[PDB]
Structure formats: structure tokens, C-alpha cells
């Protein structure tokens, strides 16, 4: 159903069954599929295609030539009714593509809230993007990629399938990420390697002096101690008993499947 | 002429002279030029521009914001009636661009069948793409490039003008190809260098144990023997008398103009 306070441009095509929330705006030449839900205050500027089983939250700004909920590029995908979920207050820029999940990959592509997805950013099938992330121009996530809260993917950077980009990570522009990136790490290059803790990011996001020091100590245990990851895992958990921000490493290790960038 | 069984959306603009085949589907806000031929069962999802002297085969799926047959980016091009040919069962994804040929380059851009051209892949003037190829997101072919059968171009990879990508090649993502890539080779980097035979690709495509071994032996003659290409050409032809798959090297050498990646 289309809320009486929603605006639907006369040139837009909203298929019967679509749900458009209060004060939403569907701009000229937009196409909205019958299984789409558009939340309150969300704006589709113009020339936007939204289809598939897709739920979009509130106060999103979706710019021209974006494709949200489209059939993914997985050669195994065969038209199964997979899904996309997008949260609130995202800025989804020109030509961004967000594709639906695969049955084999869990059936869902998810994007959280307050993200900025710059021109031609790509979110493949079965990806999970958290909150307050930034994908810079042409940043490309392959299938099944996780981008955790506050992580930044630089311009023209690709992330290999199944890789996890930890919370508060900064991946430099013109990079290729082939393994998992622990939280709070700066990564750069092709293949991307670690270049210390994202100190400026942590400072700006209210992390204490003591928390940043403990995170640097955890980074040193992983990358500078010369010990294996298995030897270092209880050392990091021990450190986390005093500085809870260090628990993000433990949580990340349990999810990691591709090894760590080194 | 528009076949009586073709669907043309009322918002689509199909110019008089265009030929639309049986059970084809021209989606909303598509533009089809007067010199375009769209084969039986081909679908233009929405917001697709097809123009120029362009022939598209059967059962193609062309996604929103794609531009097929458009004026090329060659500064020497001056509006001459050059062409595009696209075969059957291709999946041409969002924002892909396929440009018409140049008179100087032979007048034709050609794409075969069963290809997957991922988001924002670019096929410049006078390119020739074979069958069962994959161009990953943002893969960019400069003018006069050849991409032979089953070749894979990774994400964000550029191929320099006039270069040939041999059959069954795999070019890694985030690469720059500046010279010719012999068939069956893995290439990666900027400028791309060879990293052995694409064994997994050959296995998956039904090549015998004996054929893969002979191809590896031919690779060793080119890259590990320490001999010049001229010394090695009769050695490869000799090997091909027993293993016909090795003839692909001989055929490639005759077409090669940029030297080999090394």
C-alpha cells in the first residue's frame, strides 16, 4: 500500500503490492517492484530501480541510476526469492548496486544504518554492511563479504569473497583485500597488508587513551610478537578482561574464515 | 519491424526501422535506435539505451543503465556508420558499455555468446569478445582488444589497446594488462605478469590430464626454458602434433602484436 502522504511521481512505476511509507518520495522514472517496502521519509531521487524482496528503512536518500535488490551476479543463482534489507538514514549515491542474496549464502544481503555508499559502490549477494560505514567511489564488495561498524573502504578498492572487514577498519583507496581485516586496523595495498591501528578514527569516535593503547597492544600481539594466532588468542582475551574494546578482536576471530591480512 | 509476440513497454521508445524479435521484452524507459536488431527472447530490463548499427542475438538479458552500440571514445571517430554484433544468451549487467567500431579499426565491435559482463564492464570500439567469457565489475577493455573463449577478466582490471587475452586465461582482479596473454595462462599485477597455467579452469572445462600436462610443457618452453619465442615456436608446433590443445598457442602467436606478458 502507498501511504496517503507519500509522493509518487506520475512517471514512476510502483507495482501493485509495493509498500511506500509516510512522506516518502518516489521520483521521476523510478521503478518499484511488488515485493518492495520503502520506509517513512525515504527518497528515490529519479531513475532508481528497486526490486526483489527488499525492505528499505526510514529517511534514506537513494540517488539516480542506483539498482537496489536486483538479481545478483552469482552464476549459481537461479531466481530463488532471496532478499535485501537496508536500514535507516543511508546515503546511497549514483549508480550504487545492492544485490539480493543467494539460497546457498543464507538468502540475505543486509545494510545497516547511517552509511554512505559513494558513486558506483557495489554490495554483492549475501554481504552484510553494518552501521556508519563508508564505501568510497567504485569500492566493490564480492559475495558474502562482511563490513563491520564504522569501517571505511577506500576508492576503487575490491574486497574478495567471504572476507570480513572488522569494525573501525580503514582500507586505503586502490587496494585489494584478500583476507580478513581485524577490527581497528589500517590496511592498504594489493594484496592489502596491515599498517597499524586506525588511531585518528578511534580518537574521533570517543575511544579513551587507555582503550587505544590496549588495542595497539592487541595489534602488537597479533603482528609483532612473532607468536601464532592460536598462542595469542588467550593473551588478547586476558587483555579484554580489563579493556572491553579489545573483545572486538575475540568476536572477530570467531567469525574469521580466510585467515588474517599480514 | 516489431514481432506481434514482442513486448514493448508504453514508456519505451523504439524508433521506426528497429527490428524486435519474437517474445523479446523492451522494458520501461528503454531507447532502441532505428538501425538496431533485437533477437528472439532478448530482454532489456529498463533504462537501457541501444543505438547505432547494432545486432543483438537471442535470449540476452540486458540490465538497467547499460549502453549498447553507442558512439565510441576514440578521438579519431567522426560519426561513420560502424557496428556492434552481440550473440546469444549473454548476461549484460547494470551500466555495462559496449561501443561501436571505428573505420580505422575494422568497423566492428563483436561479442559472442554465453558471456557474463558484470556491472560497469566496458567493451571499447573494435574489441572482439568470444564465447563463455567473464568480465568482472569495472573490467575495462581499451580499443581493439581481443578476449578469447572462456577468458576471465577480474574486477577493476584494465586491458591496454590492441592486447589479446588468450583462451581460458584468468586475469586477476586489480590488474593492468599491457601485453598479449597466451592461452591457458594466469596473469596478475600492474603490469600483469604470468603466474602459471589456469589448471583449475582447464580441469572444470573437461581438459584431459595429458592435455593439461602438454599445455604446462608449452608454458615452460615460453617462460622457463630461457629460449627466445622464435626458437620455441617450432618446439610448441611439434608438441601440438600429439596434443591438439597446444595448437591454441600457435594460433595465438600468429595474432599477437604487442609481445607477451613476462
Amino acid at each position: 500500500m502507498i501511504d496517503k502522504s507519500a509522493f509518487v511521481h506520475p512517471t514512476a512505476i510502483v507495482e501493485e503490492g509495493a509498500s511506500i511509507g509516510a512522506n516518502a518520495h518516489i521520483g521521476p522514472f523510478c521503478i518499484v517492484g511488488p515485493h518492495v517496502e520503502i520506509g517513512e521519509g525515504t527518497v528515490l531521487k529519479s531513475h532508481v530501480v528497486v526490486n526483489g524482496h527488499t525492505k528499505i528503512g526510514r529517511d534514506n536518500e537513494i540517488y539516480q541510476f542506483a539498482s537496489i535488490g536486483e538479481v545478483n551476479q552469482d552464476l549459481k543463482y537461479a531466481g530463488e526469492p532471496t532478499r535485501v534489507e537496508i536500514g535507516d538514514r543511508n546515503r546511497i549515491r549514483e549508480s550504487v548496486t545492492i544485490h539480493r542474496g543467494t539460497v546457498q549464502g543464507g538468502g540475505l544481503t543486509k545494510v545497516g544504518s547511517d552509511n554512505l555508499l559513494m558513486i558506483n559502490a557495489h554490495i554483492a549477494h549475501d554481504c552484510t554492511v553494518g552501521n556508519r560505514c563508508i564505501l568510497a567511489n567504485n569500492a566493490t564488495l564480492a559475495g558474502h563479504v562482511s563490513v563491520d561498524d564504522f569501517a571505511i573502504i577506500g576508492g576503487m578498492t575490491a574486497v574478495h569473497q567471504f572476507c570480513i572487514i572488522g569494525a573501525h577498519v580503514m582500507v586505503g583507496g586502490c587496494s585489494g583485500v584478500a583476507q580478513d581485516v581485524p577490527p581497528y586496523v589500517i590496511a592498504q595495498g594489493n594484496h592489502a597488508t596491515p599498517f597499524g591501528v586506525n588511531i585518528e578514527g578511534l580518537k574521533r569516535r570517543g575511544f579513551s587513551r587507555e582503550a587505544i593503547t590496549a588495542i595497539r597492544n592487541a595489534y602488537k600481539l597479533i603482528y609483532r610478537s612473532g607468536k601464532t594466532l592460536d598462542e595469542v588468542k588467550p593473551e588478547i582475551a586476558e587483555l579484554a578482561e580489563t579493556y572491553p574494546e579489545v573483545k572486538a578482536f575475540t568476536d572477530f576471530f570467531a567469525r574469521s574464515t580466510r585467515g588474517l591480512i599480514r | 519491424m516489431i514481432d506481434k509476440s514482442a513486448f514493448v513497454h508504453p514508456t519505451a521508445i523504439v524508433e521506426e526501422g528497429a527490428s524486435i524479435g519474437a517474445n523479446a521484452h523492451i522494458g520501461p524507459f528503454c531507447i532502441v535506435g532505428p538501425h538496431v536488431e533485437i533477437g528472439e527472447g532478448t530482454v532489456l530490463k529498463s533504462h537501457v539505451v541501444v543505438n547505432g548499427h547494432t545486432k543483438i542475438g537471442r535470449d540476452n538479458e540486458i540490465y538497467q543503465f547499460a549502453s549498447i552500440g553507442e558512439v565510441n571514445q576514440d578521438l579519431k571517430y567522426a560519426g561513420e556508420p560502424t557496428r556492434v554484433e552481440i550473440g546469444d544468451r549473454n548476461r549484460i549487467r547494470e551500466s555495462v558499455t559496449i561501443h561501436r567500431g571505428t573505420v580505422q579499426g575494422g568497423g566492428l565491435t563483436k561479442v559472442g555468446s554465453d558471456n557474463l559482463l558484470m556491472i560497469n564492464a566496458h567493451i571499447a570500439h573494435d574489441c572482439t569478445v568470444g564465447n563463455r567469457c567473464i568480465l568482472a565489475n569495472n573490467a575495462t577493455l581499451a580499443g581493439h582488444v581481443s578476449v578469447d573463449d572462456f577468458a576471465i577478466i577480474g574486477g577493476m582490471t584494465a586491458v591496454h589497446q590492441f592486447c589479446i587475452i588468450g583462451a581460458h586465461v584468468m586475469v586477476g582482479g586489480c590488474s593492468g594488462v599491457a601485453q598479449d596473454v597466451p592461452p591457458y595462462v594466469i596473469a596478475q599485477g600492474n603490469h600483469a605478469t604470468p603466474f602459471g597455467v589456469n589448471i583449475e579452469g582447464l580441469k572444470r572445462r573437461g581438459f584431459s590430464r595429458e592435455a593439461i600436462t602438454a599445455i604446462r610443457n608449452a608454458y615452460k618452453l615460453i617462460y622457463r626454458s630461457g629460449k627466445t619465442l622464435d626458437e620455441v615456436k617450432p618446439e610448441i608446433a611439434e608438441l601440438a602434433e600429439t596434443y591438439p590443445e597446444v595448437k591454441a598457442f600457435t594460433d595465438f602467436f600468429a595474432r599477437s602484436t604487442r609481445g607477451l606478458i613476462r
Binding site: 551476479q73 549477494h125 | 558484470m118 567473464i134 565489475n137
Partner: peptide
């Protein structure tokens, strides 16, 4: 989406 990163 497979970016064929090696």
C-alpha cells in the same frame, strides 16, 4: 559477484 582475486 566473483572479482577473481588470487
Amino acid at each position: 559477484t566473483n572479482l577473481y582475486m588470487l
